[PDB]
Amino acid sequence: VPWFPRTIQELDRFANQILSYGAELDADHPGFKDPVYRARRKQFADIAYNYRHGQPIPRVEYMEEEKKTWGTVFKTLKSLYKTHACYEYNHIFPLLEKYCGFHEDNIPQLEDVSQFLQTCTGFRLRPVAGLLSSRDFLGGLAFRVFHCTQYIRHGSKPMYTPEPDICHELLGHVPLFSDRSFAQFSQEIGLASLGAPDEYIEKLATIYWFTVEFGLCKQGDSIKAYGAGLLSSFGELQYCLSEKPKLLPLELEKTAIQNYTVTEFQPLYYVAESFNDAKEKVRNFAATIPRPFSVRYDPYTQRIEVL
């Protein structure tokens, strides 16, 4: 059986397992020729490397150019949320504005966002340096821990990122982790992953893609976006609720084996009935994963109980 963390502190083992040679080193990266950007990225990676569970997340003074990039992303995306984002997103965003400094001229600090999420659902952030394996990223969700980047995309191309950056994390993921039913749903994916064979981690990563990252959900008689990749993409958030993509009901024996690519708009989205329904579906799928035990998280002790 693959090793998995059984205490929230054991997530510390993960930061000595990331891809060390990241996207920012690639010749096509928007910031590739900028050595100040390169250094800035190394500074944020070193904050993640030195972070340990339990500590406050170090605050960073963002430069004026970084705040300008954030503001461009923030104001262009904000124009779509009332009409395209799910209720849960629109419910919490004004409180993020009021209590976490989500404004066009201010990049929120992760410590503040983490404390906010803890009061909402017990979710917390951990700064992360770069790409984790699907196994380690999903395993943090079992603890309601979201590994979160702190760097921003290069300012030459504010509407484009080849990777998660802080705009994606804060505008795409954080608002949904403030909702109890979503937190429970995402955590269920994390619990399904613990000790799962690699074959099933890839199926859970695909379910994650079509839910947490690119999901649509029913809302009364309508359909809204809740996937973080959609909520942080001006173009795709508009497209996803247009007549152009194909929509199918979330059905995990189909969804888990569906192919996708990351470099164009999705041709196909899966629609969740609700986060509670999606959670029950994940729980049923998880029972099919060969694991010689069951798992449960105990929030009182922050440990995984293995039966």
Place this chain on the structure above:
Amino acid sequence: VPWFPRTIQELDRFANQILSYGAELDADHPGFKDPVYRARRKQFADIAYNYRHGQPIPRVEYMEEEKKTWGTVFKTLKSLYKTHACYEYNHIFPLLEKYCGFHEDNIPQLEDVSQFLQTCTGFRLRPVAGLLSSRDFLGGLAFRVFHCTQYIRHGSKPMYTPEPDICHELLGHVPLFSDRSFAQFSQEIGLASLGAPDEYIEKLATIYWFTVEFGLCKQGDSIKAYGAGLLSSFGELQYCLSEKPKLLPLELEKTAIQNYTVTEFQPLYYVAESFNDAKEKVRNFAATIPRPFSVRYDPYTQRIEVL
């Protein structure tokens, strides 16, 4: 409906509701004529008065005479536990000895015991100045908070206390709060109390008396003590497992209305089948309490959810 705390921080309201004119002021108190003892008691009460949720519990340097009193109580009671205390007690006591400084020559600090309990079951301590109402004392249990005294009995009469003192709390109550099933059971009594009418608070206080304070439980084919009042009473711990008292099965419609006194050994004890069984019984009794809502604790946010 009576007010009740809905967040763990709101337990702070309770310390401006204790009986201000305590047992130590009574002419029959073992320490009544000792003005140094009187001052020492006021010093511990002031620590409780100034305590707020979330803070470390102040450490106190105990005097040599206080440590001697503790040691007398500790060594005389310890002689009975292997044979008379329930398994759960005997399982955890050596870890209290090793990790919390439970020794004949050392009075454990409440901060250390609280951190220990949090790692076991999420239970925590709060220092308390004196007698709370049954409503406020039980309500803290809904949050897995045990209001705990920090003072010790007067040294003239080490085997006797007319009140909870630190020997009772640490040797009688703390070891059982380290057990998950007991923690769940005690918390269920706390949840039943929230917003309950006074009439039902008195019935829950009586159930508490016959369980948490003076309970016996089945253990395989035997019977053992788990009540804190028994585990901290050299004489009654021996008596309770002798042929002299009457024993009846725990049955809450009978137990909740049974009379008792605090000034002699109990003539009658109720025997729990198990802490999980006792918990289910409390849950069923709680459904009978007139309350226009149901309650649940969310350990992720440390709030009570009211439906």
